[PDB]
Enzyme design. Sequence first.
Site, PDB file in Angstrom:
ATOM      1  N   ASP A   1       0.832  -1.195   0.000  1.00  0.00           N
ATOM      2  CA  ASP A   1       0.000   0.000   0.000  1.00  0.00           C
ATOM      3  C   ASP A   1       0.870   1.251   0.000  1.00  0.00           C
ATOM      4  OD1 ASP A   1      -2.273   1.547   0.001  1.00  0.00           O
ATOM      5  OD2 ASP A   1      -2.635   1.363   2.159  1.00  0.00           O
TER       6      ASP A   1
ATOM      7  N   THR B   1      -4.014   5.185  -2.276  1.00  0.00           N
ATOM      8  CA  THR B   1      -2.793   5.819  -1.793  1.00  0.00           C
ATOM      9  C   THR B   1      -1.624   5.591  -2.744  1.00  0.00           C
ATOM     10  OG1 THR B   1      -2.223   3.886  -0.454  1.00  0.00           O
ATOM     11  CG2 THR B   1      -3.577   5.591   0.571  1.00  0.00           C
ATOM     12  N   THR B   2      -1.651   4.499  -3.510  1.00  0.00           N
ATOM     13  CA  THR B   2      -0.618   4.268  -4.512  1.00  0.00           C
ATOM     14  C   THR B   2      -0.882   5.079  -5.774  1.00  0.00           C
ATOM     15  OG1 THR B   2      -0.424   2.024  -3.627  1.00  0.00           O
ATOM     16  CG2 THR B   2       0.678   2.483  -5.714  1.00  0.00           C
TER      17      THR B   2
ATOM     18  N   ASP C   1      -7.706  -1.684   4.263  1.00  0.00           N
ATOM     19  CA  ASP C   1      -8.153  -1.027   3.042  1.00  0.00           C
ATOM     20  C   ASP C   1      -9.472  -1.607   2.550  1.00  0.00           C
ATOM     21  OD1 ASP C   1      -5.717   0.121   3.444  1.00  0.00           O
ATOM     22  OD2 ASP C   1      -4.806  -0.571   1.570  1.00  0.00           O
TER      23      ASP C   1
HETATM   24  N1  LIG Z   1      -9.269  -7.071 -11.904  1.00  0.00           N
HETATM   25  C1  LIG Z   1      -8.719  -5.886 -12.258  1.00  0.00           C
HETATM   26  N2  LIG Z   1      -8.642  -5.512 -13.552  1.00  0.00           N
HETATM   27  C2  LIG Z   1      -8.097  -4.339 -13.927  1.00  0.00           C
HETATM   28  N3  LIG Z   1      -7.591  -3.453 -13.051  1.00  0.00           N
HETATM   29  C3  LIG Z   1      -7.603  -3.699 -11.720  1.00  0.00           C
HETATM   30  C4  LIG Z   1      -8.178  -4.958 -11.238  1.00  0.00           C
HETATM   31  N4  LIG Z   1      -8.061  -4.946  -9.900  1.00  0.00           N
HETATM   32  C5  LIG Z   1      -7.459  -3.781  -9.547  1.00  0.00           C
HETATM   33  N5  LIG Z   1      -7.187  -3.038 -10.637  1.00  0.00           N
HETATM   34  C6  LIG Z   1      -6.532  -1.705 -10.641  1.00  0.00           C
HETATM   35  O1  LIG Z   1      -5.411  -1.689  -9.752  1.00  0.00           O
HETATM   36  C7  LIG Z   1      -5.324  -0.419  -9.101  1.00  0.00           C
HETATM   37  C8  LIG Z   1      -4.831  -0.587  -7.666  1.00  0.00           C
HETATM   38  O2  LIG Z   1      -4.743   0.681  -7.023  1.00  0.00           O
HETATM   39  P1  LIG Z   1      -4.224   0.771  -5.506  1.00  0.00           P
HETATM   40  O3  LIG Z   1      -2.717   0.686  -5.516  1.00  0.00           O
HETATM   41  O4  LIG Z   1      -5.024  -0.207  -4.681  1.00  0.00           O
HETATM   42  O5  LIG Z   1      -4.647   2.257  -5.065  1.00  0.00           O
HETATM   43  P2  LIG Z   1      -4.419   2.748  -3.548  1.00  0.00           P
HETATM   44  O6  LIG Z   1      -2.918   2.766  -3.394  1.00  0.00           O
HETATM   45  O7  LIG Z   1      -5.071   4.110  -3.495  1.00  0.00           O
HETATM   46  O8  LIG Z   1      -5.112   1.693  -2.719  1.00  0.00           O
HETATM   47  C9  LIG Z   1      -6.706   0.211  -9.176  1.00  0.00           C
HETATM   48  O9  LIG Z   1      -6.619   1.574  -9.600  1.00  0.00           O
HETATM   49  C10 LIG Z   1      -7.486  -0.620 -10.177  1.00  0.00           C
HETATM   50  O10 LIG Z   1      -7.919   0.180 -11.282  1.00  0.00           O
END
Ligand SMILES: Nc1ncnc2c1ncn2[C@@H]1O[C@H](COP(=O)(O)OP(=O)(O)O)[C@@H](O)[C@H]1O
Lengths: 535, 537, 147, 146, 523
Positions: free
Chosen positions: A68, A101-102, A399
């Site tokens: 994260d 957050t990422t 999260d």
């Molecule tokens: N099954 C999936 N297919 C396509 N994209 C995905 C899938 N699962 C997650 N994602 C993408 O991966 C990203 C993960 O973001 P993340 O690092 O969790 O954000 P944060 O750091 O704010 O929690 C999301 O923006 C999402 O669009």
Amino acid sequence: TLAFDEYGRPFLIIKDQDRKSRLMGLEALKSHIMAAKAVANTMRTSLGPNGLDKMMVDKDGDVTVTNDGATILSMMDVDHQIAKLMVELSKSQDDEIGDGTTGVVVLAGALLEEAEQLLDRGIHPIRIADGYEQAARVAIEHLDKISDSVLVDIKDTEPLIQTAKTTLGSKVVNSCHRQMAEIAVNAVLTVADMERRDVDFELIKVEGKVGGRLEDTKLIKGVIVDKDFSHPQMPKKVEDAKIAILTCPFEPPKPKTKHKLDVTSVEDYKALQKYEKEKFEEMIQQIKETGANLAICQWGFDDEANHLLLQNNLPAVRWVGGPEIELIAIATGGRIVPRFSELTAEKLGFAGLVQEISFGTTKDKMLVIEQCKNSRAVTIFIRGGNKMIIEEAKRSLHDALCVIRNLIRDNRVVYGGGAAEISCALAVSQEADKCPTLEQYAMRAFADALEVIPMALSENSGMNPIQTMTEVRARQVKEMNPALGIDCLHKGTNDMKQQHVIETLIGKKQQISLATQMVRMILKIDDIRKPGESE
Amino acid sequence: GPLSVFGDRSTGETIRSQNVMAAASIANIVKSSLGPVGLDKMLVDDIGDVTITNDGATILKLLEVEHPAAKVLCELADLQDKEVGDGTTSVVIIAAELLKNADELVKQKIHPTSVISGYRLACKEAVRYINENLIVNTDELGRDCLINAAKTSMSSKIIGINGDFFANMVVDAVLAIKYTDIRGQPRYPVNSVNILKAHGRSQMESMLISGYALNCVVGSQGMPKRIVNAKIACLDFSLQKTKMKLGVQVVITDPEKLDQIRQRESDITKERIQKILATGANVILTTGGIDDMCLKYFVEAGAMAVRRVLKRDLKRIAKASGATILSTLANLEGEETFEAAMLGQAEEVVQERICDDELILIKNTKARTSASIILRGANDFMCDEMERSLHDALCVVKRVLESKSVVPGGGAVEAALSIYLENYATSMGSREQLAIAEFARSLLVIPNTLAVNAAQDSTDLVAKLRAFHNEAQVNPERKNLKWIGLDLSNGKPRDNKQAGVFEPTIVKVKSLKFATEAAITILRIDDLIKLHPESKD
Amino acid sequence: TSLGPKGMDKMIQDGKGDVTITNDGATILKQMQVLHPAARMLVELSKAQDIEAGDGTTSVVIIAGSLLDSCTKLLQKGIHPTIISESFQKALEKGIEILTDMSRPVELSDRETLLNSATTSLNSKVVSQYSSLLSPMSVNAVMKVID
Amino acid sequence: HRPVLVLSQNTKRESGRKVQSGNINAAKTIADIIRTCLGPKSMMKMLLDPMGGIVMTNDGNAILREIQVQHPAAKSMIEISRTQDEEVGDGTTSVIILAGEMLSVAEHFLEQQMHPTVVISAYRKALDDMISTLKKISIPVDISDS
Amino acid sequence: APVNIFKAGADEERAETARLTSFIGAIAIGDLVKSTLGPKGMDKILLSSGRDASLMVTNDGATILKNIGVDNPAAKVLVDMSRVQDDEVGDGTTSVTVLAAELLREAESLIAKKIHPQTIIAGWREATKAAREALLSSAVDHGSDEVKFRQDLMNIAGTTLSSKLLTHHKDHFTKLAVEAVLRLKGSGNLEAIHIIKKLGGSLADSYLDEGFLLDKKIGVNQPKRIENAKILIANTGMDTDKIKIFGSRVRVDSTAKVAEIEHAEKEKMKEKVERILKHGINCFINRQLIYNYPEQLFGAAGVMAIEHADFAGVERLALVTGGEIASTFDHPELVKLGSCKLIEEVMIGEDKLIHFSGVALGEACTIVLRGATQQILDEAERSLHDALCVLAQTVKDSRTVYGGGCSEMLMAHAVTQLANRTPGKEAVAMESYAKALRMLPTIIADNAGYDSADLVAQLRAAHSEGNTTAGLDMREGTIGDMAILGITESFQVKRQVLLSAAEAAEVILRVDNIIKAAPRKRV
Ligand SMILES: Nc1ncnc2c1ncn2[C@@H]1O[C@H](COP(=O)(O)OP(=O)(O)O)[C@@H](O)[C@H]1O
Ligand SMILES: Nc1ncnc2c1ncn2[C@@H]1O[C@H](COP(=O)(O)OP(=O)(O)O)[C@@H](O)[C@H]1O
Ligand SMILES: Nc1ncnc2c1ncn2[C@@H]1O[C@H](COP(=O)(O)OP(=O)(O)O)[C@@H](O)[C@H]1O
Ligand SMILES: Nc1ncnc2c1ncn2[C@@H]1O[C@H](COP(=O)(O)OP(=O)(O)O)[C@@H](O)[C@H]1O
Ligand SMILES: Nc1ncnc2c1ncn2[C@@H]1O[C@H](COP(=O)(O)OP(=O)(O)O)[C@@H](O)[C@H]1O
Ligand SMILES: [Mg+2]
Ligand SMILES: [Mg+2]
Ligand SMILES: [Mg+2]
């Protein structure tokens, strides 16, 4: 000249000006972009379900493998004031929403990279910052087009599970992708106040113990504390517990002031023995008169009071924490009683299977509460193979507990996987020609930076960024724009509505709002007044 | 990311402000040594040598500088000595004020190429205006122009007396070395005047030796130190024993032939000394060396022989006395001829007393009647100051006699150019008029410095100065106010035509051309890179 | 900032103490002594422009500094650098055909054409105010020794 | 270690009243050294040499040559006594006391906001009148008389 | 981040030295304890630089990794992995360290093959799911017919003690480990088996005591042995009570009243002992210290007094005698007393210990370990602790699998059968999972000095067509049947070797950036 005047006098303005650093120039804006792009290029590889984790080592030598974006930037020793604002940006996303957050750091580094080529063309940095506000406003209004949810918290938990699978899909809990997703859904709905749309995370206790596996993580409706039965022959299983919660130690009553009690004759010393002998028989009988068969005490026990528990068949624990017994009175429906004289049958708690479970060869013996009656406090017991997989699962499931909280605050959703970023990039490009007076180049730099987040998902999935993004973006213009993104194994078609990639509206609404305002505070700066050496 | 140079890089308005403070660090030094109310300085070295001077070239040459914009103004003062010779405090103050007013323009987001092009339109117009507003050439004033131009140069130095003692000695020195050239060029080489120093009596006992004053001794104390009706024999070869060269060696096979070779080294030597002395020559000057064996032939015959004279001093004597500089034997395979008709002539060669030293004087030289000045001062610090002040005074009368044109001094030129260039900037000025308008304010620092060093009124005397020059340009009623200057002893504007404050034309034409050209190079240091010193590797 | 008629010169002071003012791009990069190995290839690029053309020295660093700057977004799109090298040659071979259509054939006998060419190169230097004398002297020094 | 961007490194600058009134006190200091060596009731002054010798004298020239000073205006007064020693014989101690007194009265007019060129122009007019006074009070000498 | 580094004293690496330092630091941990795996593997001796070095020889992989103090960041994950394996099942800490290192060694072979690291994670999750079904379908349950379950328990203790220092003591130490857990007759508390280490004698002189041993010998003028006694223990204060009233003084007017108070204090201490002897006892055990005034009262009544045994010493006496703690003496009809036959004192290694011979309801044991040196006793205590913890969980989970390399070839066969039914993107990662499972019988075969290239090849050919019980015979150096030789391990031990190594290799393979912070007080 510096440190000298034209008349020969020493020219000293500020103290220790020889060991100072000042940059106004044209590279002061260039030094802010190159310091922020290296943070965004680090967090680019940890985005999406194919995002690789990072190994963080503390100052004490402790190693924590984190994915994260909140904990990665927080555990750095970066002494750079531009990159320190990226740490507080990922911390502000965790405190408000807690899912992107990422993505909020890669987006902020993308807006500054597109502003680097705009800076060489002669555009003022505030004119780029004023152009990003007119461009981010289009991305907010376009994100509220397709948004609907049918959550009723009774039987339609299917949109709630698929929302938590998007958050847990990028972490290391993909082996428990269906099991642990249903834990975070039921943990929020049992503690949330739907009349006020407020969720309190103090009622959700997240505990962890090494041993077992990731599949042994269960949602314990109740509380899990360290059981400290003072008698080793205490019964380790209570079928129907009338829990007597008290906050008074099993001792003769000691006042809070200085007493210095005087003993004069031998009749007063024999009165001391009969005072304590009847006090330990009074504190034990007042629990048994209420019908209780279990006692919780915050403070310690006396040795004389320990054997009186076994004679009356009254198990009791010792030295429970502050907020731990606050969770027992809500899970059992009892009341915390200050004294022993105020005990009654109405202030008792109700619980079912009260037992301690030994884990392997250790001597912890945590409490397991199986049965309850309309509890408003749950406890998640995370197990694993090592402490690296447990402390990450405490951060991964937190999260997942936050994205269910955001659905109660706002029941509108979007479709992730880069589908919302490509659709918002087309809205800025359509309004860049209405009108291209001054901020035409500033809005096109915003739309080119919104495409960095879906093209980072194509890079981590082994695909090509410019080949995959050109195919998805062209299909949203030739017809009406669907939930069209990408994935790792791609699940056949690229429809995010069929792949059930569901993200919250206010999660991505704060990703564009916080990254634009953090860019405005690092574009509207033309001087650095940092010192030199430490001493 | 950034530049990976191992030195130091500073861009923007940092170097644009540092070059002005580098030029103002030099101008604020020499501002206290300008005009008749200017005062001298002290230049103390690390070894203990003290140099008391007020000339703008001697101060900046001995002063150590480090900044690259500071070396431009220091080398600007060195060029004024060769080109003009007295114009070498005024150029440094103008060239630094040209950068001070142009720094105020580039802080107004005006491009420096418009300031460079604006300065060229004002510099070429200043030479055009000064060549059409001169008073008269050297025909009307006569000898009064040469004396009054000499006293203006001496007013800033130690020889600025109220009388005309030092003024008449300079005019009589340049007028006695009039050397004609081809195509009608009356050249006046002022480097041929041997300026000598001796700590003796006061400055009123400075002798004007009509002839040449050789700074050497006789050597052997058996020669007559005064020869009347002398014949000077100028020659450059060492009168020592005949030493063979590297390719010639003496390899003798007979012991009887040993002593004849040993006596031959002195017989060939004395054979030259008898054929240069039988022709009536009494004074022999030698740049080489006369050993103790050859000094006997001058004591026996009663002739004077001066050894180890300078090569630059022998050319000034042989050209002024009609002598021929002979290095060896010549004239078509002749053994020893010496061309005795080409001996020099002199009225009297006398070694006088110069306060515990020996000095040889030649009187009128019978051919060209040259001149040499022997200075007299209190200590050696005054004699070094009197030599620099006299050499700058010789360069003033040289340019007046060559270029017969004088301008009024004391800020009269800078007052007329301060108002003509303001009207010139209004006619053809669209975007470069602000650089021509600041060119006039930069020229006003020369009458401004005369009011500061005199402790007079500053913002009122110069305001009264340009009040007369404004009426001389906008009111064509023959006011004749083009020669209005400053009276620093009284504090009122005076007429420099009747007061006798005259300066040459090229002391201000070459000053405005060198200061404008130096201000262009320092105006283009918007980027500066300073590398680390490569000393120990 | 050292390109065009409105450009300013740079002064590089070396470790020996011989500071010179320079505006030509070949003379600046040889005196800066950049320690980065990729930046030293840009110094030799302006050196060969001084040998072949003589009047292309500052502009060859602006082009090569921007062609690599344009490859910053190209390398972040999964494009292989061999594909960028193939496409830069196709833009180079098409670029000469565009500059040939803008060219006008002139003759060396026309002194007014050779005078305006030499005056353009002097507008960027310190002698732009002396272009009424140096630019006629630059043409007459060439057209009398070339035959 | 980056060098400091200075101009005219390791040199001093001093102007104003500290140099005009500073050279007077350096001239008054030398005149107080040989002040007890002018009249016939004078006393000897034992000096010590860096070679190890001893110069016990009361002549004003031999005393000032054995003094190594660091002040620049003090080095000018030593060269004055060297000039008087080579021109005449007994013209040494009298010039150093007189030049210190002519600068003592010159320090008074520098405090009255008077320019130093006014005092020097009055000194040159006074110098031309001191030469004409000594030639009127002189007396011809019979050099043939023993 | 290396280019234009914005850190003070911290360094980092991304995808170049991150996986390089992770694969070097994890293989060197697995190659360290590689020589300690199997029934013929050697042992290590651990030493410090000085300042009470306290040398401790251990063969178990958890005790080696918990004391070395590795400076590598990725190597601490495998150190913490073996710590949980010792705390959960107590065995396989060496087997889970080599298996997690052989997975990352096969993952280092996939560096040059340009395989995406997320494909190896998805390929190993399907490989671990196929390996769980191989152990679950081959587990042998034991319900009734207890004469086969006690024989099965001796095969568990015989397999665990064969890889330790107790090599030629399987005829004795197997009976000391099986009968110790068999006398518990309940939950595996793992603290009723108190192990006492005494110097002098060989390991064959060690024995399991039929009663219980203790220290802090019986008083001064008290009897040393009482036949047919009633044991009552206690956890109460005897003398200098200062009873629970903080802020109470004796404020009198004369010194004659102080003599009346201190006589009244000793009368209440005498009345407390008089409440103890109303139960009709002959022995007394107090967790706290017994001073001189109640010690004279027990000696005059002919009652023993064992003062300050241990905090956990009264818990083992309550499980071996069948009584209660009884810290309050006011109801003799509600206090259950212990039972014994002889409380004679025995001398083991010139130290008199209190032997509780002939106790009733003895759910506690005492192992008297005797060895040549202290280094042997510290190794035999950890070797017995690694054997009692498995038998305490074998009685809770009676499922057993065939060890000695037979379980690893069953797991590697199920992965290879499903590696051929997969496309070529994830099939290469599944073949590397099956090759690392075959390394675990290869380390055992090569530690004895056998031909490991042929014995594992004979095991792979045997398991490919039948032979579900075929394993490695370390006695003669051939391939034999594991059901005949009796080499079995527990199901929960072999599951935690497979599952924890697959989860720990998942964490290190997913690391692409190692950002270590600036340490404190290191210059
Ligand atoms: N099954 C999936 N297919 C396509 N994209 C995905 C899938 N699962 C997650 N994602 C993408 O991966 C990203 C993960 O973001 P993340 O690092 O969790 O954000 P944060 O750091 O704010 O929690 C999301 O923006 C999402 O669009
Ligand atoms: N009698 C006078 N009245 C007014 N001004 C004078 C008089 N004599 C000299 N000056 C001024 O003093 C200045 C001295 O300049 P100077 O330092 O000699 O220049 P440089 O250093 O080039 O020789 C001259 O510019 C002149 O105008
Ligand atoms: N009169 C003018 N008007 C507009 N631009 C000009 C003028 N004169 C020169 N330039 C520009 O200034 C630039 C100078 O380039 P230059 O530094 O000489 O290149 P190089 O370093 O290769 O010689 C040219 O590209 C030209 O376009
Ligand atoms: N008998 C005397 N009566 C009065 N004054 C005397 C007598 N003898 C010497 N003096 C004075 O003492 C002074 C000595 O001066 P002196 O130090 O010798 O000068 P210098 O240093 O040049 O030799 C003379 O100026 C003279 O007037
Ligand atoms: N009699 C035997 N025959 C074959 N293999 C054996 C025998 N005894 C032990 N082994 C093997 O030796 C290995 C010892 O592993 P061990 O180091 O005890 O693991 P851990 O450190 O996790 O307890 C076991 O995996 C087992 O398969
Ligand atoms: Mg997520
Ligand atoms: Mg050019
Ligand atoms: Mg084992």
